[PDB]
Structure 1
Amino acid sequence: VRILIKGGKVVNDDCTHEADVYIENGIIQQVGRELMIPGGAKVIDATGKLVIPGGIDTSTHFHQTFMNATCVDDFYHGTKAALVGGTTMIIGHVLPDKETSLVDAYEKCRGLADPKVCCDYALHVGITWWAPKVKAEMETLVREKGVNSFQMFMTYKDLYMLRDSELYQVLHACKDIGAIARVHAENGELVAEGAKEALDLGITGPEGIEISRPEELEAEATHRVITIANRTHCPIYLVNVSSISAGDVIAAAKMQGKVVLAETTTAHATLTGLHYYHQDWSHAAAYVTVPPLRLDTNTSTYLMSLLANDTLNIVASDHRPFTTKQKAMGKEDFTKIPHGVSGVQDRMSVIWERGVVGGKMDENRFVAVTSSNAAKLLNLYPRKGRIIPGADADVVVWDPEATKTISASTQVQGGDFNLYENMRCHGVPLVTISRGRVVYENGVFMCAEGTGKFCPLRSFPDTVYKKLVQREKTL
């Protein structure tokens, strides 16, 4: 199919310029001010609109069973929800249990996604335990399964948690094979203790998710894993950065030149922990994720500043909705509320509103934090995350003068609730092109299950490893 996006302003992370885009066979063919095209192309009037690269969501949890609940959205509904939301790539999480096979898990997961995905996708494999079998499977996945990031956890003691001796080996292992070490940095011993301590104090509502794990526990673990990583020479990538404290640790480490990357979520960048104290339990429970939204009023504002600043590089949804019925399995015990929020569809709009409209960052940084930096790190740049010739035609015609008001009653993503209910948004995708096809236009979604493709991710992503390799010379 031939597509021409006429009269737009192309926005990339470096600059915004008046140009048309001509797409043929899944690929951006031309980007120029006035394009001589053979006709019979679908023409899109993009006047007064921005032509941005399609969003990439570096943390989604479609079809994941976590904490005894299975995520409401499968790989179809999830990718669909993404595309309607202006996201044209999603990275999945694979969380194999302790003492189980990473490769087997990866394959189960590929089996669940390939037939069903609407947009391109890739996967993180979680390293939940450590033995010589695991190092082996890591190597296999990188060498020939198109995996270049692994997700580790410093909390979920006795479930996902890794000991410091293990992280050291795991990070060493990642660096050797050219992977990216994603770590979720909370101190798991103190999280375990603080949970029991809170239940024993008679604290059982959703607010306990906060009281049990105050930000010092994040700040601590974050600082620790950065040190480990810096010792092992492994690039470390921090997920779900939730707090001012943790954010500063990251800031500092970066200035010292430590190869630290970092990612927050939409909810963390925009919402406060006050919601855990809302009158309805259901409402409080809808916001339960980890690390939790922080009570301090200034935290969201600050995380957004850091995001604009590149202290935080990437914003993701961490999409993992559960129903209020599902959440309710912890109505009497907060520790049994499964950690998950709904966000895959809201990310682009919510971020545009609070980040761009709110004056914290320009439209170009918005591209940076929503697609470009992701693409660079995943090793897909500029094939994705940029509107230039040769690129994959993952393109969104973005309307900066829109009307939508977020409501759960109109969302196409899973969950009883939307964390952004009633939020007035001026960012809205009008058209979403994925693989050089229009999958969403006029508010109408149209796409076959399985149209999307797994995108093997190449090891040793240039944007992290090229300096590391050089710097290890001077040692």
Structure 2
Amino acid sequence: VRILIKGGKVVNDDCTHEADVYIENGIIQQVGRELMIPGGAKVIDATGKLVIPGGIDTSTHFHQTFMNATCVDDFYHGTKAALVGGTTMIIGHVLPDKETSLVDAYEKCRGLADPKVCCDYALHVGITWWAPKVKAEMETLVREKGVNSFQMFMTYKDLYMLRDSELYQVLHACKDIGAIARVHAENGELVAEGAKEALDLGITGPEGIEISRPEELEAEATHRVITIANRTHCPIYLVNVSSISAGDVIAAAKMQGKVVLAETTTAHATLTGLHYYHQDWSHAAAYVTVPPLRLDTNTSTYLMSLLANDTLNIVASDHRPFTTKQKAMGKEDFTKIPHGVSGVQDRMSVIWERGVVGGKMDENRFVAVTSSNAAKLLNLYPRKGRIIPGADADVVVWDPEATKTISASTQVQGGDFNLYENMRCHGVPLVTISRGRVVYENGVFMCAEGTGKFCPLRSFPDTVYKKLVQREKTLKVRGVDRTPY
């Protein structure tokens, strides 16, 4: 199949220019004005529209069982929703229980995903415990299973938390094999104590998740893991950055030349924790995730500015929807509300509205935070994240003059609540092209399950590791030459 996108503006993360785009056999063939193409192409009129790289969502949890609930979206519905939302690649999470095999958990995820995915994907692997067998499995995964990123938690005590000596060893191992170390940095002991205290004070409602983990617990842990990472010489990637305090730690570390990257979520970047205090339990529960949304009304604006600024690099949905009925496992004990919100479909439009229409960043920075930075990180750039000849034809024809209002009743992503309910959005995907085929057009989705493919991710991505080679020569530490005492 052969596709001509005609009359639009191509928007990459570096600049915008008027140009048509010609696609064939999964691949962008030409970009320019007045192209010489074979006749019989499908012509897509993009006048007045922007032609952007499809979104890449670096955090998704399709099919995941978590806190005794199974995410409502499997790999087919989740990728569909992504595509209807202008995202053309997802990275899913693998989360083995403590003491279980990382490789088995990865293979099980591959088995669920390969036959269902509608778009390209790859996987992060969780490191929820530490032992010789874990290190050997890390290695196997990077060496031959196309993994280059692991996820660790500083919180979820007794479930997924690693202690400081374990993190030290884990980061050392990630660095040796050229992997990215993703970390969720809240202080797990202080979280556990805070939750227990709040319950003992009679706070059982969803607001407990905000009260029990104030932002200093995030800032502290973020500061600690940056320091551990800097001592092991491992690039560190903070996830779900939620607060001004943690943003400030990250900015100060970056000023000091430390190798720190950071990601936030659509929700953290746009919504306040005031939702946890809503009179309706279900509404309040529906915003429950960690670290929690914050009360400080400056939080959104500041996180959005950090994104515009490249203090935060990447924005993800962290999609993990649950229904109100599932959330209600914690109707009487907030610590049992499963953590997850929906957003894989909302991400592009929401960030467009608050980021670009809101004047925090321009359309090019929007591409950077929604695809290009991720692609570099994953070692997939410019194959993904850029409209140029030779790249994968993962392309969105984006309408910056659209009329969409977001609602749960029209969404295709799972969950019974949409967090952005009633938000007017000026940017929507008009057409989505994935692997050089139109999968969404005129409001209709059409794609067979299993069309998408796993994309092995090569180790040592340049955008982080290239400078670390030279930096490692720079840390030349020698003693003083004395004669012996």
Tell me the TM-score normalised to structure 2 length: 0.98
What's the CA shift for 1:33?
1.3
- Shift of the alpha carbon at 1:328? 0.1
Distance 2:313 2:113 in 1: 27
- What is the Cα deviation at residue 342 of structure 1? 0.3
C-alpha deviation, 1:259, in angstroms: 0.4
1:36 Cα deviation from its structure 2 partner: 1.0
Deviations 1:368-402 (A, max 9, x none): 00000000000000000000000000000000000
Q: CA deviation at 1:355?
A: 0.1
Instruction: Decide which moves more: 32-41 or 103-112.
Output: 32-41
In the alignment, the residues of structure 2 paired with residue 216 and residue 247 of structure 1 have an alpha-carbon distance, to the nearest angstrom, of: 11
SS of residue in 2 equivalent to 1:91: strand
Structure with the greater alpha carbon radius of gyration: 2
- How far residue 469 of structure 1 moved from its aligned partner, in angstroms, is 1.2
Equivalent-residue separation in structure 2 for 1:33 and 1:11 (angstroms)? 15
Q: Secondary structure at the match of 1:247?
A: helix
**Which residue in 2 is equivalent to 1:434?**
434
Deviations 1:1-54, CA, capped at 9 Å, x for gaps: 000000000000000000000000000000011101111100000000000000
Matching residue of 1:17: 17
The 1-side partners of 2:258 and 2:340 are apart by 31
Please list, as runs of the form range in 1=range in 2, the aligned pairs for 1:412-451 lying within 5 A after superposition. Answer: 412-451=412-451
> Where do 4+ consecutive residues of structure 1 move more than 2 Å?
none
Deviations 1:299-331 (A, max 9, x none): 011000000000000000000000000000000
CA-to-partner distance for each residue in 1:414-472, whole Å, 9 max, x for gaps? 00100000000001000000000000000000000000000000000000000011100
Distance 2:204 2:312 in 1: 33
User: C-alpha separation between the residues in 1 aligned to 2:434 and 2:127?
Assistant: 31
Give the whole-Å Cα distance in 2 for the aligned partners of 1:348 and 1:213. 29
Counterpart CA distance in 2 for 1:429 and 1:291 is: 30
Structure 2 stretches lacking a partner, 5+ long: 476-485
1:357-368 counterparts in 2 under 5 A? 357-368=357-368
The offset of 1:278, in angstroms, is 0.6
Q: Partners in 2 of 1:205 and 1:414 — Cα distance?
A: 24
SS in 1 for 2:401: coil
Give per-residue Cα distances to partners, 1:253-287, cap 9 Å, x unaligned: 00101000000000000000000001100000000
Give the C-alpha shift of residue 404 in structure 1: 0.5
- Report the secondary structure of 2:425's partner residue: coil
Determine what percentage of the aligned residue pairs are the same residue: 100
SS in 2 for 1:422: coil
Q: 1:408 is paired with a residue of what secondary structure?
A: coil
* Cross-structure match for 2:481: none
Deviations 1:215-234 (A, max 9, x none): 00000000000000000000
Q: Trace 1:361-400 onto structure 2 (pairs within 5 A).
A: 361-400=361-400
1:407 is displaced (CA, Å) by: 0.2
Q: CA deviation at 1:145?
A: 0.2
CA drift at 1:361:
0.2
CA–CA distance in structure 2, aligned partners of residues 336 and 474 of structure 1: 48
Q: What's the offset of the Cα at 1:201?
A: 0.4
Match of 1:130 in 2: 130
Report the Cα distance in structure 1 between the residues aligned to 2:207 and 2:337, rounded to whole angstroms. 11
What displacement does 1:178 show?
Answer: 0.3
**Equivalent residues in 2 for 1:157-168, closer than 5 Å:** 157-168=157-168
Distance in 2 of aligned mates of 1:396 and 1:126: 31
Counterpart-to-counterpart distance in 2, 1:65 and 1:232: 33
CA distance in structure 2 between the partners assigned to 1:301 and 1:293 by the alignment:
13
SS of the residue 2:404 aligns to? coil
List aligned pairs for 1:245-260, cutoff 5 A.
245-260=245-260
| Deviation for aligned residue 1:170 | 0.1
- For residues 228 and 40 of structure 1, the distance between their equivalents in structure 2, rounded to whole angstroms, comes to 58
CA-based RMSD: 0.3
Structure 2 CA distance for aligned equivalents of residues 388 and 96 of structure 1: 38
Secondary structure of 1:123 counterpart: strand
- TM-score, structure 1 as length reference: 1.00
Using the TM superposition, give the Cα deviation of residue 345 of structure 1 relative to its aligned residue in structure 2, in angstroms: 0.1
Determine the C-alpha separation between the residues in 2 that align with 1:85 and 1:273: 25
Structure-2 separation of matches of 1:402 and 1:414: 23
Take 2:331 and 2:410, find their aligned partners in 1: how far apart are those partners? Answer: 27
For 1:319 and 1:359, the matched residues in 2 are separated by 26
Partners in 2 of 1:120 and 1:347 — Cα distance?
17
